[PDB]
Design an enzyme around this catalytic site. Structure first.
Site, short mmCIF file in Angstrom:
data_model
loop_
_atom_site.label_atom_id
_atom_site.label_comp_id
_atom_site.label_asym_id
_atom_site.label_seq_id
_atom_site.Cartn_x
_atom_site.Cartn_y
_atom_site.Cartn_z
N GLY A 168 -13.10 4.47 -5.92
CA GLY A 168 -12.70 5.67 -5.21
C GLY A 168 -11.78 5.36 -4.04
O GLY A 168 -11.70 4.23 -3.55
N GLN A 169 -11.08 6.40 -3.59
CA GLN A 169 -10.15 6.29 -2.47
C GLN A 169 -10.93 6.46 -1.17
O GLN A 169 -11.54 7.50 -0.93
CB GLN A 169 -9.04 7.33 -2.59
N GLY A 170 -10.92 5.42 -0.33
CA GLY A 170 -11.64 5.45 0.92
C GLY A 170 -11.03 6.38 1.96
O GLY A 170 -11.60 7.43 2.27
N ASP A 208 -12.59 1.06 14.27
CA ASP A 208 -12.91 1.74 13.01
C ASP A 208 -14.32 1.37 12.56
O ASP A 208 -14.58 1.20 11.36
CB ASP A 208 -11.89 1.40 11.93
#
Lengths: 199, 322, 13, 99
Positions: free
Chosen positions: B19-21, B140
């Site tokens: 999946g796209q983070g 982050d």
């Protein structure tokens, strides 16, 4: 002093009056043709329907592979002329899902099914074309084909490599519920909640 | 954008889609030249602003790998980097799931064990010490950006696409999200590596309890949630902030914004109403570990960056040493 | 019947 | 009550080439084809209208003596000349011949 520059020509068109901006856009098209921004600034500084249509036709004859020029040409004509321009834009630029959605939305269901099939054959990884086909199927007399179309779209997205992130599907369901497509919106919400026990 | 079955740079066949983070696609692939060894392929977007951020993240990962040869700092180790279809393709070590999936699989408002939370806090302190030794601010720290192993014994800091240098500290409200937002970055003051320590403390508080630490809807809501927990902000910390005019008045009074017409309430004093000892809570040893974790969270999430605890003080605390 | 239009003339040219 | 209007905006910019209609009515077997660099559009020879039971080409004997001297050498007339013979020779009203 610096010819063939789009930003300098845009600044010169924005700084000059429109009677001078038309000649500046003509000189920029003579020095650097096939520019989408210069053609858009020339169509925006025309203040007429026929002049903007002629500028859009000249931009389509110069550079037919511009999606912005086709979007500016289709939004200023008749809806039948908009469909006839969107068909040529889909035949010239098959990688534009918005032009295919505008061609399928502005026609009958027998043409919208062929437009959705052509958009699925050209761009299989596009998810907005399947949502537009589901909305067009829900807007027609059929009501049970939207769930099967959503299941086929989810299977095609799982086989192509676009995983469900559960963020764009909720926005597509909200846009479908805001436009009168609550069946496909509920199907997309159920598909997002199924792939998105107590937690 | 990638498809399953297709090989990346003729050596890594993509096997699964993770999946796209945030802005890059993550996949689990198998290297054919490394005897079917698993690896994580990160494909950046086609935009130039995303490609420059991916190149900066790859350079930061290479600097973190060069700064720790033994990989004893709980950082992501990248093997190599290639290109495929005009996109930046980074190859890293594979992981099972992040801390957000481990918190979602443990139940709503349940949390993990005390020993696992202590190990996660020690890994976060080691990652903060590695970021301070490399002179690079991550900013982050999140449970979704910190991955774990298959047995969930060791953690690894990843998703370094938003990191920046400590010398170029831009005074901007485009910092981290409000779940782990620093008060000095929200007030417009100077930022340091202590903001990453405060974000790691806010992540450990979420991994210990199972809920959000400060679920603020904006910068003013995050400032109110920080003032309700760590007390009122000092005058020396509020005077050094560039964005203090939108959160504090001329007489250093707290201006809370509320809905219903946007109303503004002025408060001269702010008393600590949040209870850290009552939240995130059993035998006596687990109660003592929870009290030590609450004391470390109270010492780490202070409003002043100079009065906060460092990485060496957090690693040598009673909660980490047990 | 050959019906002439602006979009067909733009696509043909 | 009087208002100064724009006399140049209401005029036609093309003049003699100004087309008031948008679409053009084409015949049935009048297809077009783009062979190489140019589009050729053909339109075949249209069939004339059939004459009625009381409509035919009137000869010079039906014309009076005042009009017989002008039609020297012509035995018969055309279709449009015989269909409007009474409107141009026997009627003095204003005629509009769209031929």
């Amino acid at each position: 002093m610096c010819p063939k520059s789009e930003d300098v020509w845009l600044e010169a068109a924005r700084l000059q009056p429109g009677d001078t901006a038309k000649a500046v856009v003509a000189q920029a098209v003579r020095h650097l043709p096939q520019s989408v921004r210069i053609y858009i600034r020339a169509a925006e500084l025309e203040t007429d329907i026929r002049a903007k249509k002629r500028v859009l036709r000249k931009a389509l004859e110069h550079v037919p592979n511009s999606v912005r020029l086709w979007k500016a040409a289709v939004e200023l004509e008749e809806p039948e002329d908009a469909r006839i321009m969107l068909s040529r834009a889909v035949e010239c630029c098959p990688t534009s899902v918005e032009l295919w959605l505008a061609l399928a939305r502005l026609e009958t269901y027998e043409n919208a099914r062929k437009v959705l099939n052509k958009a699925r054959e050209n761009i299989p990884t596009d998810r907005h074309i399947w949502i537009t086909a589901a909305k067009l199927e829900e807007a027609n007399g059929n009501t049970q084909m939207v769930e099967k179309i959503i299941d086929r779209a989810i299977t095609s997205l799982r086989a192509n490599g676009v995983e469900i992130n559960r963020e764009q599907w909720i926005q597509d369901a909200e846009e479908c519920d805001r436009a009168g497509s609550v069946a496909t919106c509920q199907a997309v919400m159920r598909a997002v909640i199924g792939i998105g026990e107590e937690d | 954008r990638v498809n399953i079955g297709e090989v990346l740079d003729k050596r890594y066949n993509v096997y699964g889609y993770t999946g796209q983070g945030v802005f890059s696609n993550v996949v689990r692939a198998r290297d054919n030249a490394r005897a079917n060894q698993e690896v994580a392929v990160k494909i950046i977007r086609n935009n130039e602003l995303m490609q420059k951020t991916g190149l900066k993240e790859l350079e930061f990962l290479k600097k973190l790998n060069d700064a720790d040869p033994d990989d004893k700092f709980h950082c992501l180790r990248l093997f190599r980097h290639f290109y495929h279809k005009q996109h930046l393709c980074l190859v890293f070590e594979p992981l099972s799931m992040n801390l957000r999936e481990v918190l979602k699989k443990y139940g709503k408002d349940v949390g993990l064990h005390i020993k696992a939370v202590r190990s996660y806090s020690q890994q976060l302190f080691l990652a903060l010490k590695l970021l301070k030794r490399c002179n690079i601010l991550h900013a982050d720290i999140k449970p979704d950006n910190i991955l774990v192993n298959e047995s969930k014994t060791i953690l690894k800091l990843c998703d370094f696409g938003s990191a920046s240098h400590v010398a170029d500290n831009d005074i901007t409200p485009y910092l981290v999200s409000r779940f782990y937002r620093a008060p000095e970055i929200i007030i417009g003051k100077s930022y340091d590596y202590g903001i990453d320590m405060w974000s790691v403390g806010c992540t450990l508080y979420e991994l210990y309890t199972g809920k959000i630490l400060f679920p603020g809807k904006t910068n003013n809501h995050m400032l109110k949630l920080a003032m309700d927990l760590k007390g009122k902000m000092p005058n020396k910390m509020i005077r050094k902030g560039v964005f203090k005019d939108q959160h504090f008045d001329q007489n250093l009074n707290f201006m809370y914004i509320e809905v219903d017409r946007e109303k503004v309430t002025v408060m001269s004093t702010i008393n600590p109403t949040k209870d850290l000892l009552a939240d995130l809570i059993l035998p006596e040893d687990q109660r003592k570990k929870v009290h030590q974790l609450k004391d470390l969270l109270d010492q780490i999430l202070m409003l002043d960056p100079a009065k906060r605890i460092s990485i060496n003080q957090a690693l040598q605390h009673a909660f980490i040493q047990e | 019947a050959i019906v002439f239009n602006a979009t067909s003339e733009f696509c043909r040219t | 009550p009087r208002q100064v209007l724009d006399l140049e905006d209401l005029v036609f910019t093309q003049g003699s080439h100004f087309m008031a209609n948008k679409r053009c009515q084409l015949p049935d077997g009048s297809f077009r084809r783009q062979r190489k660099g140019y589009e050729e559009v053909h339109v075949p020879a249209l069939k004339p209208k059939p004459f009625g039971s009381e409509e035919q080409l009137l000869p010079v004997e039906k014309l009076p003596k005042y009009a017989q001297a002008g039609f020297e050498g012509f035995k018969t007339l055309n279709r449009i000349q015989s269909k409007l013979y009474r409107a141009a020779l026997e009627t003095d009203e204003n005629l509009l011949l769209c031929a």
